[PDB]
Design a protein around this ligand. Sequence first.
Ligand SMILES: [Cl-]
Ligand SMILES: [Cl-]
Ligand SMILES: [Fe+3]
Ligand SMILES: [Fe+3]
Ligand SMILES: [Fe+3]
Ligand SMILES: [Fe+3]
Ligand SMILES: [O-]
Ligand SMILES: [O-]
Lengths: 141, 142
Amino acid sequence: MKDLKGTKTAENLKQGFIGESMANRRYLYFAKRADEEGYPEIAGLLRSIAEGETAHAFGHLDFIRQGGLTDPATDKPIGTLEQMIESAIAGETYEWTQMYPGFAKVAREEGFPEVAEWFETLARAEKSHAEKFQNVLKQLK
Amino acid sequence: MKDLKGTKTAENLKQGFIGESMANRRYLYFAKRADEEGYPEIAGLLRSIAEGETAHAFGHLDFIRQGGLTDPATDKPIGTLEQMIESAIAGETYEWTQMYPGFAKVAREEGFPEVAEWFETLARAEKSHAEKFQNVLKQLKG
Ligand SMILES: [Cl-]
Ligand SMILES: [Cl-]
Ligand SMILES: [Fe+3]
Ligand SMILES: [Fe+3]
Ligand SMILES: [Fe+3]
Ligand SMILES: [Fe+3]
Ligand SMILES: [O-]
Ligand SMILES: [O-]
């Protein structure tokens, strides 16, 4: 499609993607509370609305990719499958090398060791994810 | 740990939630490409890792709620089910009354009519979602 680089629309697609991604997660989490409390029609509606937000997020990504823009999460191209895997590696690498260890250090300093332990678990998990994606890329290449 | 308000850890839980939410969406989108091209093991790995990112996002929300913090998307409390639905209503109302119409106008003015039409479709969709959540709240209240 038409080149979107440098436009306000490019930034709006990114912000739309972020919001739709959060909406799907939020509504599935809310649905679990409706499930527990015995509101199956509410829970089912939440889950169906969440599928709408999936469609919205994926459509934002379609326009991002067709317009020559980069991944909202990593600023890396996601045109081809190899590029997609390279974006996954980059994001996971940021999370285990910088983001979650830093979150863990701050949580410990602020006196929240249980939250710190969670952030440390997540740091190890993202390193595992990064390693698994690196193996995929080697195999594609 | 039950009062995290005003701490850096509170902001980090919010940012972690945002990143994990995007990761799940991204990896499921990437899996469709692996599917089409005939890489079922890659697609399966993407889907399985995406379930990990769901667990991470939900765990961040657990700590947010237990610490008395608000919904990352709307800054509203999400302790009870009614509060959760009220947060959904507020977010959807922002999206249909302000966010997507504004995005659509910018897209039209910049010469991207297909993107504008998509944003207009989404504005109407979020208005419908808001009405459905309003119905849910009516049902919870009797
Ligand atoms: Cl129900
Ligand atoms: Cl495969
Ligand atoms: Fe949406
Ligand atoms: Fe990750
Ligand atoms: Fe994660
Ligand atoms: Fe929405
Ligand atoms: O949305
Ligand atoms: O992640």
